[PDB]
């Protein structure tokens, strides 16, 4: 996060760290959706142009964290992965369309003050909140600067931007499976996701039931905080049946 | 990054 703030304690209880076993390292963000399922971006696991391709073994999931770097002695929980599922039509060859993946943990995790799942939107929720101008929230332990590392979990609040405007800022082909978010240069107010933030949640708080909903997955952007540029996210409601389906077939 | 206790994994 660029131009964000340190999170309060128990502010984003679904926040998950995707951690490399060796070299022990911060891969990306992710989000907890039940006691045995985690949601992240497909590009955190598979990116052939960069020879990136992680399996279950290469990874560790860390839940309940606040500090980036410290072992959080009786707070955090470490989980091992049972299976990885990537969307079958994830397009890595051209615009990262359908950038989504599920993670099935070996054993159910126990909730606590610092560990709790976020909700998945229903058609009606998507319908009233996913509007240009409405603000959502992004969290992560990523870069603070385009070109260091924060000590604690960062937070930033950003507005959804109109499709045309999104379309008009890049030479990449945007899909219905994407949405862009950020402040305009006019609006002079700023912030963005940055390297290492990838795959965490874009959440909204519903005014009807006062519940937190995950609408986006931090997907891609050009630079971090660049004027006239925006952050792109995987449109979670549009991939809901695929999600629904893998949980139906392989789990819960 | 502090190491993770063999007793956490």
């Amino acid at each position: 996060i660029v131009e964000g703030s340190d999170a309060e304690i128990g502010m984003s209880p679904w926040q998950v760290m995707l951690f490399r076993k060796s070299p022990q390292e911060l891969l990306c963000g992710a989000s907890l959706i039940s006691d045995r399922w985690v949601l992240t971006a497909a590009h955190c696991l598979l990116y052939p142009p960069w020879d990136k391709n992680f399996t279950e073994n290469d990874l560790l999931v860390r839940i309940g964290k606040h500090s980036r770097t410290r072992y959080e002695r009786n707070i955090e929980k470490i989980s091992m992965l049972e299976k990885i599922y990537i969307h079958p039509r994830y397009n890595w060859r051209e615009n990262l369309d359908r950038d989504i993946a599920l993670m099935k943990l070996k054993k159910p995790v126990a909730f606590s003050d610092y560990i709790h799942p976020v909700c998945l939107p229903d058609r009606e929720t998507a319908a009233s909140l996913l509007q240009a101008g409405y603000k959502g929230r992004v969290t992560g332990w990523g870069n603070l600067k385009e070109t260091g590392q924060p000590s604690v979990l960062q937070v930033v609040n950003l507005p959804i931007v109109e499709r045309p405007v999104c379309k008009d800022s890049t030479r990449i082909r945007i899909t219905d499976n994407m949405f862009c978010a950020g402040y305009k240069p006019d609006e002079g107010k700023r912030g963005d996701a940055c390297e290492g933030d990838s795959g965490g949640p874009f959440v909204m708080k519903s005014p009807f039931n006062n519940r937190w909903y995950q609408m986006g997955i931090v997907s891609w952007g050009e630079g971090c905080d660049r004027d006239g540029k925006y952050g792109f996210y995987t449109h979670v409601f549009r991939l809901k049946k695929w999600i629904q389906k893998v949980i139906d077939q392989f789990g819960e | 990054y502090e190491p993770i206790p063999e007793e956490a994994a």
Partner: protein, 33 residues
């Protein structure tokens, strides 16, 4: 949706305490609830 007790924080929603910037989100949905 997401899960079941989903999206209600034990340190905020559960105790009726607000976080320092959630009012910024709700006032944009042209003042929440």
């Amino acid at each position: 949706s997401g899960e079941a007790d989903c999206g209600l924080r034990p340190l905020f929603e559960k105790k009726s305490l607000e976080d320092k910037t959630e009012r910024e989100l709700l006032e944009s949905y042209i003042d929440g609830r």
